[PDB]
RNA sequence: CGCGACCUCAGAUCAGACGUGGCGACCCGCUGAAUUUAAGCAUAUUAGUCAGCGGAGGAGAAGAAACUAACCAGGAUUCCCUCAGUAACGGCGAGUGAACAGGGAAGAGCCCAGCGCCGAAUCCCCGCCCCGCGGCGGGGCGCGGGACAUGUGGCGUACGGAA
RNA sequence: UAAGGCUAAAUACCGGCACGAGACCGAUAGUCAACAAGUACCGUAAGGGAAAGUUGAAAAGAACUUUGAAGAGAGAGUUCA
RNA sequence: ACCCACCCGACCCGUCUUGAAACACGGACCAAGGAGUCUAACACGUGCGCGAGUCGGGGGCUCGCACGAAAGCCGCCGUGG
RNA sequence: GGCCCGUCUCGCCCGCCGCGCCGGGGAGGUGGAGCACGAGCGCACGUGUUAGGACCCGAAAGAUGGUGAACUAUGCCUGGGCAGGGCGAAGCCAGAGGAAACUCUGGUGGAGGUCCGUAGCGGUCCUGACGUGCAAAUCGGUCGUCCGACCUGGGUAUAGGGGCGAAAGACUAAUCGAACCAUCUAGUAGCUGGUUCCCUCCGAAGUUUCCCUCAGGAUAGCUGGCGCUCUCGCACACGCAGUUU
RNA sequence: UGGAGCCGCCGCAGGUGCAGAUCUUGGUGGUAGUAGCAAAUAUUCAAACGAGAACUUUGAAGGCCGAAGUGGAGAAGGGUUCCAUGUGAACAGCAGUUGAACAUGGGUCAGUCGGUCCUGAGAGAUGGGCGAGCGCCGUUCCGAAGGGACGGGCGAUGGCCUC
RNA sequence: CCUCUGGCAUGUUGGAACAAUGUAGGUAAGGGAAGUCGGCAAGCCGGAUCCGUAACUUCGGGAUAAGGAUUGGCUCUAAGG
RNA sequence: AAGCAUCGCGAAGGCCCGCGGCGGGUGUUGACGCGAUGUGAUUUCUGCCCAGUGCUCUGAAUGUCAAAGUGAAGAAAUUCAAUGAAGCGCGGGUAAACGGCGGGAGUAACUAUGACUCUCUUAAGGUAGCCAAAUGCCUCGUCAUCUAAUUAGUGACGCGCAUGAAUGGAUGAACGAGAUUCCCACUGUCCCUACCUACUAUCCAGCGAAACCACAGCCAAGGGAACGGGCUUGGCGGAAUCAGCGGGGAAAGAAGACCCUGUUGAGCUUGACUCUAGUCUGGCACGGUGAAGAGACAUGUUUUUUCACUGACCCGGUGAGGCGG
RNA sequence: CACGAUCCUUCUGACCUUUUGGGUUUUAAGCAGGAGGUGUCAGAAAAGUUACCACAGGGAUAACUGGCUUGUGGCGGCCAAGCGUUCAUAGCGACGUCGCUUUUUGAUCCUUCGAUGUCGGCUCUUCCUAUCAUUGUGAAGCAGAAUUCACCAAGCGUUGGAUUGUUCACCCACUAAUAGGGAACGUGAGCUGGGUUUAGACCGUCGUGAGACAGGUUAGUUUUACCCUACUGAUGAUGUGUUGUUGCCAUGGUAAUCCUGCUCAGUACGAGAGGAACCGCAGGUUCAGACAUUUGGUGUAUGUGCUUGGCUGAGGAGCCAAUGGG
RNA sequence: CGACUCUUAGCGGUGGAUCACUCGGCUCGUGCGUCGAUGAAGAACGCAGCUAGCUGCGAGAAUUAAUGUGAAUUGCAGGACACAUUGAUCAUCGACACUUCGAACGCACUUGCGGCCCCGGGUUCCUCCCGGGGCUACGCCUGUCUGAGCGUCGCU
């Protein structure tokens, strides 16, 4: 029958992103030169609230090095981040927080986030809100650094990619209970429609593959192959386990 | 014409 | 580090031209159903049909055989009569379905590339004069521009052609 | 003799301009439409879509008198009616 | 043939149905409209013409068609069926 | 009886430019929509049977291409709106006790998808009113909620097997278990309904076998029409039967 | 009665004969002067006009809305409904001397109040790509995407070529 | 709920009656849910001040729990800047 | 709904759109995130079952498995052969995946129950809890309580037709226009009805519809398509009307929603039949350079394996601003 | 009786035909006979569900009534083996048998599918008798009291509640008795809508699932009368010359009911225990028909106080608040 | 007889059938076979002495010119004209004209904003200001001018 809730949302229209007061990308600073040789320094002018993000973000200016002009970046604020700070970044960056600097400077132990998962990406992994990644260990030939991420997976990297020291600012947000729909409902209307969230169980057989029956059932298991028509891939998806 | 009855209402009902 | 050829590319309210939309009975190119029939239905059928898009002309399309035939042979295309509801297709069911010959309507045939020869012998645009000018043409005269040898024009194309 | 090209004619024509005809219809017919019809009217819109011809030869369409606030009458007159 | 009286007779039509006055449906009344058509193909019957033939199409020749988009004629009379 | 073609069986001979895995015949069966001194062709009318809108009216559906979010659904942008009371959360003050830890008492403070309750938004019950209404869903009282997942104008986004859905198959312009408009379309109908003047003559069937057949067809039967061939009450008859012998 | 065409016979031709189709279009009854003209407390007296007053107007009294208004102003929507004079056919479910009816005329004046400008969510060309195609996507992305300015220089003209 | 400012003529009519049925309001002796599927409907309760407040509990509540008393008019007093 | 719990994804990615694009949404995002499902605050729990159906993990050790490619014979169409991808099989995991969770006999110094024993059986055989519940056929279960009386209410009991643990079990303060039962109060709900008010209805002036309508309209019985207004036989029958009334007109309303038939449909489902977008795999093409080696056949050919290379192709960054020597 | 068409396949068969401009060869195509099957067997290739449902129709066909039938249910005879201490028959009545009844349920499908509103309760009228009580009587295994059996007989009655949607059922209470039925299983334009029986939801069992369940639960629109008749009441009608009067009466209707107490009487009767009746007298039930002196109810005489908020400057006098309240 | 009802007829209403007409259709045929950036079709808004609609036209607006025709047009007015004169009125239509949207074109759809050349007032080129005029779409071809490139060369 109908094309499912899900299906729905690949077509935008009403589930796009709500973007109005976002404060911008939350990017790195662009490789050059300087970053490339030696180390730009930039003042934090401030620190940042960025509408559908848990953490923190910084306005932190530089001055261009070829024009008369002072450019400016959105960090995601490293823990301990302040205002009047000066933060350095490049090859030859000192290695303490708020302070991106490539993985492969950095010693084993090191603890980043906002890392770049490719050179020149600006900032992909690890940027979430108490969340960092860890430095393992460098092969000096190949070029190549092994980084373990928040996930658990412990990922190749190029060398060269740069990373921000220190963790993320405004860890443990999810440790505080929500208790209210209604604080809810404000969480995600700075976000996307994709809140109040009806269970494929409730609805009629047209509208989803659990719908219908006389008792609320799923009637047929719930985990499913990914070689799965869109429109029937749904509950679990290529489940390896199942259970507790 | 004349409303007379409703749709679910169907008079003369002998289920 | 200049200046000059060309090549490939831009920009001009550059000079002068064209194209755009309409109509849509007829016509050309695509696209393309399902009611329906089969006493059900899926192939089939309805149908290369309706709707959809494109482009024309006073007509369009086609057309001067990489054809028919198998004869003692016909000789572009289109149209009519016939072939013929035939050969063939088809859950060989429903249903569908041409062509050649034969007789008429009409009747008309041609040109390149190439291969070659000929001082590019060719073309376009400028400007001055004479005619002509409400379908921009003739003739002449200009060391006046350009196209063109990465090929223009005359001869010539299978019915043979050149010298 | 293919992989390049041009070509009138007999052929088509429910659109157009301009004509001619009919064993057709004759105002509930014939076109939706004989008329100020794709009009009025409806619908947000795509679209839908009517009804409606006839005094008399001639307007000669009733001067004037009278009742009534008037519409309406009663006489008078016009017309072959 | 208008009305009235009286005696006897006499349920409302249409329809489907084995069976309708039916407690089966349709029907307040009147006017106008309103449904076995045309084409094609087959078969049998009948009428006419010619007859081992028959044929007419299609085409052509005769006119500006008033009647004619008829009528007539054709080594095409038979390519062909 | 005979002849022609197909076919089989059995047989014995003929022929010549090419003698051959050549060609031709005979007898007896048996298949043929055949021959056995022709009847067709054309035109016209009638009936029947079909294919076509196909006697007239009738679906639920199906397909193509378009129009709508002025209602309503949800998102987004920008604006507007929400009496008076109750309860009294953190923080703060003082006083009293406590050896300390800290605890009591009185204040202050004003939290909350907090309570009452107006406007607002809604819509429980009376199964009240109304029920050819005021109204194609209204009215009255009674009700729920009333600082929040609150109400609400305008703008803007999403369109039909598509949207949107705090999910009722809800809503998508009085239309939704697939909107509306035009077309394909006079869609199909073994099923309802109707089917137009008179007299005259004849006059049925509801049984057969077959059928995805049982509300229909086919095929026999029963009917009518057209005839023909003969018969003889024209002193001069053969055959036939819902009998009987 | 009507006032301009029409019939008999022989042939041919057909959109050729109605009581029905919950048939179509138009008309007319009985029902019936019946149902009905009952939501939101309310009227009364005198006068004026006038053919005519339960309803107009004026005056007097009695009543209601009771500033979350039956008051005073806008938005959207309407489109002349506004104002005046006149009419009393029709319409305003009794009436009307009245009206938002009908017929005559009038009537909307801006640098400052708004449109106008900006951008919002979003919409949408170009380049580019897809696309049988009408087109679609995309809106910074596969762009040589600025035509502007200042200061200097050189030229040209227009001006008491001074400036 | 009553009033001024401003606004209206009772919402598309009037008059005469005061029957039954209704629609919308009220009241009822004694009993008090015996009514009815069912306390549906209506009735009780209601403001404030002063007392008083259970089970249970997520210790926040329950809670206007329940249950009581008072309330007018008049003439004074005291207390708050 | 908060809370709990699973599952997919490290971006040439998960999920999803789109007819197509070096297209698009999530995403101005990066696992404290995005996406897909369940359960449904708190408290307290969450038993066993991986046999079935799912999902998933591994993979030359290997059955089958297409097109191409390779060989074979053939005059050739060709046939036959070897080769062999995913997928199926084969083997592990998974129940907060869909789901599932037994039956006989005998046994205690009165009897009765049966702690106990014996078998037969499954993937286990229903655990904690809970109960005649919104779940119990029998059923008005039995006991108690509540009433004068209770098919109701509550509390107990439990071989429970057919309870039961995130198909969530047991609970539970606060809350509820939610479903019950009782008590106090209160009442016209009732015994049993009555009176009053307003607007109606009523009569009048003015104005003025509609549905419905074969004809019509008094009964009893008879027969009759088996309940007649009309027919038969009886009773009988008297203009024109007013206000009421709901017995009858099998009254009106709407070509019965039920049921059945139709070779009529639509919505939804799946182990129906026949397909299909999507996706997964293999082949050929765009598709190149070098190195090394390695087998297979043959006495060069093919298969290529792995490792580099960059020039196609891709991705990211930037106002392409310092690249390699 | 033991089996199978077209199409397709496959095998077998002939010095067979065709394989198209001709020839040779493979291949294919023909011709003829067997085999591979259609069991729905004269021969489609084919799963559910719909309570979200639709359309064409059907009384050719179900779910009511009503007809026919009466098995089944209900009621009643006949016979007489027994029971009844004794005695077939006071009361009973086996084994057998004959009937009626349509308040049971079945059969059946005639009527209605262009719809006859589908259970129960309320309310109201009328009929039947197959008589519970009441009147008059026969019988007894009737001493009295209590009683069962039968006859005439349907005049008059036959109640209040608890549980249940109920019909039915049961219990409490009263009573004279708490008999049984019919009228489209009387009665939805009379109500009600609790239950069945749409759509929303839950639970159990069943189903892979959509969904199912004479298995449970909860939430869920009850329209129209102004026509005709019938009934109720209301004006009138023809006649009598007109009018008025006082009257008669054809025909319709129709009504009274049952109980207690006292007395008879602690009497009859009886061993006693217990324990009547007729006539009187006093009252009450239910029903009917009136009425308002009295008691009660109503009350907008808007009568007369009293009182809230407001408003006429106040007093006095009043008014408003859909009847301000009392 | 009285009222009412039924029936028939007369006359009158209601209603618009019938019949008779037909500047319209329907069908068959003939000839021709023509739109547009020189701005189409279509739309809009205008225009009459009194004119709303239909038609006709475009700010020269129920039409101008020209040619043909030869006294009207007419609902009423008014007028013209010498109808022995280019001359009323029709017809034709070759000259002229043709508001705004629209392929639709400066960019936008408010009817809003502009740029660039020239002209008149304004100045006395002082730019402003006002008014007028002419340019200012996209695509594409042939040329033209200006250019770009660690594209391929040559000379210096
Ligand atoms: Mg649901
Ligand atoms: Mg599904
Ligand atoms: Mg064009
Ligand atoms: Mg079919
Ligand atoms: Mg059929
Ligand atoms: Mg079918
Ligand atoms: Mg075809
Ligand atoms: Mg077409
Ligand atoms: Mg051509
Ligand atoms: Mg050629
Ligand atoms: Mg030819
Ligand atoms: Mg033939
Ligand atoms: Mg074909
Ligand atoms: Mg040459
Ligand atoms: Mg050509
Ligand atoms: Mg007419
Ligand atoms: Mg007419
Ligand atoms: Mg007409
Ligand atoms: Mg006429
Ligand atoms: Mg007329
Ligand atoms: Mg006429
Ligand atoms: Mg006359
Ligand atoms: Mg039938
Ligand atoms: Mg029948
Ligand atoms: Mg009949
Ligand atoms: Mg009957
Ligand atoms: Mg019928
Ligand atoms: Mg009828
Ligand atoms: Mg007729
Ligand atoms: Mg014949
Ligand atoms: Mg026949
Ligand atoms: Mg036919
Ligand atoms: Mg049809
Ligand atoms: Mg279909
Ligand atoms: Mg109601
Ligand atoms: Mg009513
Ligand atoms: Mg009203
Ligand atoms: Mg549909
Ligand atoms: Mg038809
Ligand atoms: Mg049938
Ligand atoms: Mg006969
Ligand atoms: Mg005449
Ligand atoms: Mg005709
Ligand atoms: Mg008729
Ligand atoms: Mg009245
Ligand atoms: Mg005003
Ligand atoms: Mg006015
Ligand atoms: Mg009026
Ligand atoms: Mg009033
Ligand atoms: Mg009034
Ligand atoms: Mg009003
Ligand atoms: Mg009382
Ligand atoms: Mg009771
Ligand atoms: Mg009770
Ligand atoms: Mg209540
Ligand atoms: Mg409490
Ligand atoms: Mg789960
Ligand atoms: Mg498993
Ligand atoms: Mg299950
Ligand atoms: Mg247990
Ligand atoms: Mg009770
Ligand atoms: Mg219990
Ligand atoms: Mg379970
Ligand atoms: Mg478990
Ligand atoms: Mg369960
Ligand atoms: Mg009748
Ligand atoms: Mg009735
Ligand atoms: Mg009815
Ligand atoms: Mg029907
Ligand atoms: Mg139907
Ligand atoms: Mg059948
Ligand atoms: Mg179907
Ligand atoms: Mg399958
Ligand atoms: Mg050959
Ligand atoms: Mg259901
Ligand atoms: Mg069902
Ligand atoms: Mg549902
Ligand atoms: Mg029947
Ligand atoms: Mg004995
Ligand atoms: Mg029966
Ligand atoms: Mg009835
Ligand atoms: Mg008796
Ligand atoms: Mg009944
Ligand atoms: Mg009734
Ligand atoms: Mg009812
Ligand atoms: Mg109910
Ligand atoms: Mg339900
Ligand atoms: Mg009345
Ligand atoms: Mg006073
Ligand atoms: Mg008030
Ligand atoms: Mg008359
Ligand atoms: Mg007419």
Redesign the pocket.
Known sequence: ???????????????????????????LR?????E??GYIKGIVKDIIH?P????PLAKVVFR????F?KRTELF?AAEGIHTGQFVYCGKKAQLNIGNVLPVGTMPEGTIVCCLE??P???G????????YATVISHNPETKKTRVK???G?K?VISSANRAVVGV?A?????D???????????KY?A?????????????????????????????????????????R???????????? | ?15
């Open positions: 029958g109908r094309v499912i809730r899900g299906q729905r949302k690949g077509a935008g229209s009403v589930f796009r992103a709500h973007v109005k007061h976002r404060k911008g990308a939350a990017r662009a490789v050059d030169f300087a490339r040789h960025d559908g993000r848990g953490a261009d090095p070829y024009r002009k995601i998962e490719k020149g990406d600006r992909k992994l690890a940027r979430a809100s108490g969340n991420l928040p996930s997976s990922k993320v405004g860890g443990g947000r999810i505080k209970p929500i208790l209210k729909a209604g604080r809810a409902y404000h209307k976000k996307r429609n994709c809140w109040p969230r009806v269970r494929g169980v409730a609805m009629n057989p047209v509208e989803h593959p659990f719908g219908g029956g006389n008792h609320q059932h799923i009637g047929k298991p719930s985990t499913i192959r990914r070689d799965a028509p869109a429109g891939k749904v509950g679990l998806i290529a489940a390896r386990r199942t259970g507790r | 014409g004349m409303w007379r009855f409703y749709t679910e209402d169907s008079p003369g009902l002998k289920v």
